[PDB]
């Protein structure tokens, strides 16, 4: 399950109180219609942040092996390191932005929790 790296290279929107507010939002005081709508929307959300996490982990493992690959001179794997690294970083910037967007959106909606869906 998602957990902090504890560096300066993740995105600090993992599970502070955000997904947590949405965790109690599975039963807090919303409505049945809203709930099942939220349920699917967050199921896509959780899935995507879970994959972001998977790639942040592969990034740190890439980064470690990168400094270790540049520290051999192999060239080919130095480049393949950079290629998959740029890909993974592309997904961190984009997913992180998308998370922050939906963060403020769902934070917006659930903090009312309107009544007839949101």
UniProtKB/Swiss-Prot annotation:
Q: Main site of residence?
A: endoplasmic reticulum
**Coiled coil start-end:** 1-71
Impact after mutating residue 63 to A: Strongly reduced interaction with LRP1
**Could you tell me the keywords of this UniProt record?**
Coiled coil, Endoplasmic reticulum, Endosome, Glycoprotein, Golgi apparatus, Heparin-binding, Phosphoprotein, Signal
GO BP, sorted A to Z: amyloid-beta clearance by transcytosis; extracellular negative regulation of signal transduction; negative regulation of amyloid-beta clearance; negative regulation of protein binding; negative regulation of receptor internalization; negative regulation of very-low-density lipoprotein particle clearance; positive regulation of amyloid-beta clearance; regulation of receptor-mediated endocytosis
- The organism's place on the tree of life at top rank: Eukaryota
Question: Where is it localised?
Answer: Rough endoplasmic reticulum lumen; Endoplasmic reticulum-Golgi intermediate compartment lumen; Golgi apparatus, cis-Golgi network; Golgi apparatus lumen
Spell out the molecular function terms from Gene Ontology.
amyloid-beta binding; heparin binding; lipase binding; low-density lipoprotein particle receptor binding; receptor antagonist activity; receptor ligand activity; signaling receptor binding; very-low-density lipoprotein particle receptor binding
**Residue segments, region LDL receptor binding:** 1-114
- What cystine pairs are annotated? none
Q: List the ranges annotated as motif Prevents secretion from ER.
A: 115-118
Provide the transmembrane region boundaries: none
This molecule's function is given as:
Molecular chaperone for LDL receptor-related proteins that may regulate their ligand binding activity along the secretory pathway.
Family of the protein in this entry = Belongs to the alpha-2-MRAP family.
**Name of the molecule in the record:** Alpha-2-macroglobulin receptor-associated protein
Q: What is the lineage of its organism?
A: Eukaryota, Metazoa, Chordata, Craniata, Vertebrata
């Amino acid at each position: 399950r998602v957990s902090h790296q504890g560096y300066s290279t993740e995105a600090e929107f993992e599970e502070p109180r955000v997904i947590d507010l949405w965790d109690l939002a599975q039963s807090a005081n919303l409505t049945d219609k809203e709930l099942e709508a939220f349920r699917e929307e967050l199921k896509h959300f959780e899935a995507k942040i879970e994959k972001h996490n998977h790639y942040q982990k592969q990034l740190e493992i890439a980064h470690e092996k990168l400094r270790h690959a540049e520290s051999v001179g192999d060239g080919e794997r130095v480049s393949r390191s950079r290629e998959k690294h740029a890909l993974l970083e592309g997904r961190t910037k984009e997913l992180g932005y998308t998370v922050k967007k939906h963060l403020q959106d769902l934070s917006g909606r659930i903090s009312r929790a309107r009544h007839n869906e949101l």
